[PDB]
């Protein structure tokens, strides 16, 4: 019931990220896009990823864009707004 819904619904789009070890992008509510490989997921979209690259844009408070890299991180499913899977690892 739960496994078939996870392997046949939208969560299968997450399950293709951890099985085939592909890179996907996650756009959050803080105007930040983190591209990385999804290592661990759950039913509440708790994404524990490794080797992530987060890019955004900031103002001095003209503005300018910036980016950074993290070895391993974990983000909750509440702040995850958009999740895009694209063949970028090849």
């Amino acid at each position: 019931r739960e496994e078939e819904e996870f392997n046949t619904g939208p969560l299968s789009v997450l399950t293709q990220s951890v099985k085939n070890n592909t890179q996907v992008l996650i756009n959050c509510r803080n105007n930040k896009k983190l591209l990385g490989r999804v290592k661990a997921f759950d039913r509440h979209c708790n994404m524990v990823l490794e080797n992530v690259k987060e890019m955004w844009t900031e103002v001095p408070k003209k503005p300018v864009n910036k980016d950074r890299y993290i070895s391993k991180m974990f983000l909750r499913g509440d702040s995850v707004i958009v999740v895009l899977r694209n063949p970028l690892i090849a």
Partner: protein, 82 residues
């Protein structure tokens, strides 16, 4: 399957937690509950456009935590086995 059992087994590790308001608290994770109640000891918190402050203890809720940051030497492959 359940991320709460993986987060509860990450005790005695120096991690960081970034909230939704831009405040980043870096400290040693000492207590994790089922509701992701992060109780840390000897933490350092830096808010948005403010000075970092060191506290002996801190208790952050699970709904207020936006992102987490773990060290690179964390055994994520061994801790994932239930």
């Amino acid at each position: 399957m359940k991320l709460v059992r993986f987060l509860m087994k990450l005790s005695h590790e120096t991690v960081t937690i970034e909230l939704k308001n831009g405040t980043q608290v870096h400290g040693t994770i000492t207590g994790v509950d089922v509701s992701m109640n992060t109780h840390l000891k000897a933490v350092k918190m830096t808010l948005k456009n403010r000075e970092p402050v060191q506290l002996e203890t801190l208790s952050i809720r699970g709904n207020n935590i936006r992102y987490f940051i773990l060290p690179d030497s964390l055994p994520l492959d061994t801790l994932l086995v239930d």
